[PDB]
Structure prediction request, 614 residues.
Amino acid sequence: MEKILIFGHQNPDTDTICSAIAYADLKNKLGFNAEPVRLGQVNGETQYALDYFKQESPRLVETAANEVNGVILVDHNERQQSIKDIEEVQVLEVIDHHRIANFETAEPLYYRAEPVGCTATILNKMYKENNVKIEKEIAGLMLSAIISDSLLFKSPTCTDQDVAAAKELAEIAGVDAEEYGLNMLKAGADLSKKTVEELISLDAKEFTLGSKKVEIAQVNTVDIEDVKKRQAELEAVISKVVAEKNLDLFLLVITDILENDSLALAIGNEAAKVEKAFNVTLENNTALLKGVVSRKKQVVPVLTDAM
Amino acid sequence: MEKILIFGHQNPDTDTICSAIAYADLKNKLGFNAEPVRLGQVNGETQYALDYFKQESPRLVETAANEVNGVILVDHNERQQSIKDIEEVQVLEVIDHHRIANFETAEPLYYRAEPVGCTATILNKMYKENNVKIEKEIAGLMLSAIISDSLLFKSPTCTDQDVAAAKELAEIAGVDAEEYGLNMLKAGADLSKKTVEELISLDAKEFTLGSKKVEIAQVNTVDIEDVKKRQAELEAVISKVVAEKNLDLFLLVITDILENDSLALAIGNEAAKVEKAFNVTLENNTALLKGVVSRKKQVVPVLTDAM
Ligand SMILES: [Mn+2]
Ligand SMILES: [Mn+2]
Ligand SMILES: [Mn+2]
Ligand SMILES: [Mn+2]
Prediction:
């Protein structure tokens, strides 16, 4: 069997990593010579899953032309998202779940995209279609990918198929879908292992709306509780920054990526402007901003018009 | 259910007509509201199949945006091949077997392309995958599509899957794959309903190689037998032409488009030049010219350097 390289997009998500490993397995079990490969660094989320299921991190690669003549794309299809020298190899097949664009083939191929929330959901169909038993080990990676892409079935893109697939895989992998999922999701930005001065600095941008000096920092977690439990220390560091930068307002936006609601911690003179722009009542400088997940589209415009 | 329109490319081939009808059936049996549609005239090959299995010719359409919001594409994906106002509707899904190009979607969709020789081969998988019984009537249309696209399994694109599918469908439809196939393929161009003087003129070009007056006519069939059985009448009309035009050689090249071999019927003084240039032995003025399919590239250059 000519050798094939299977891999997902750049800036690898858990789907791009796990699905590549998963399909490579399926392919090999069907008599081919395939190897899972990644095009970037494996993030914490992915890691937790790889480690939990004792799986080797797919080999890093910069180009494919030098190793093979044909490749298989998973979780993507647009050129920019693919390998660097993609123009120089033949896309044998694509297993994906996104729009189709900036993609084109000179020859026919096995393209299989479905309107589901995760590439793994599709593979799972393919395993059964080819009647190939799924190893406990990999089923977990697949289950991981689904959880990852569907934000634990809470994602707007999640589907009844994704959910039924996750359930099915979680049993085989001998785990509890939601239980394992939360842990994995958590290992994402692991804030529990970060300084209170670190959180207030990650995604922080300063503005000067209405002649007032302001700073809005955001932090994404799968449980606002993890970060609210440390409000004392947060207020401390925030108050410091407010002093050093002579800020009229410092708005920390603690977003729950699962429930799409984000808790706000406003410290400043214009801390009342957060109560106006979002129509809320700050009680301990903490008010739940419902439905707010983006500050560029939901926070900045509503506060600019509040002052 | 929102209404959907299912259709193939323009200048409709039997795959584009039958697969559109077939998949609309599958879709309806699964609870949707779909209608098979065509973008052009139904040719003779397709007709024979439609009539044989008592099936109505899918409705002619010029645009879709006015009727529906979503469409399903079968047997194609490149814009130019699709409907006129394709840009104005949403491609819900694509069941196809060609390269992907000049195609792009804003949203995700169900895209399913396989490296087989016919769109119907894929539908057949899909019927079983969804466990839906295939009505005798439509199985025939699917069988037709496969026969049409694979030139009775002789096509270079034909696959083991296409043949296995044709067999399976042929039984259900209660017919003999190759028996019905030939009749259908024949109804395409149809040489059995053409004058012997008509065949020798479809594609006849005269040359004057080496000071000698010559004429080479070509005829493409799916069974040289259909044309050889009428050799008596052929030689009669050829000999007449040879007399009226004072030809030193009239070479009729009867090409079998299935086997890519073409039988030669040479009548003239230089009738031995065909024996030299092709390295053969004329027996009854008929010798099999193996591998010869083009006269511009394979007959003319080898006969010019022979006389
Ligand atoms: Mn992805
Ligand atoms: Mn994905
Ligand atoms: Mn076609
Ligand atoms: Mn076709």
Q: What stands out?
A: Residues B 15, 75, 97, 118-119, 149 surround manganese (II) ion (ligand 4) (CB under 6 Å). Chain B touches chain A at residues 97-115, 129 (CB under 8 Å). The domain at 190-306 of chain B is CATH 3.10.310.20 (Diaminopimelate Epimerase; Chain A, domain 1).
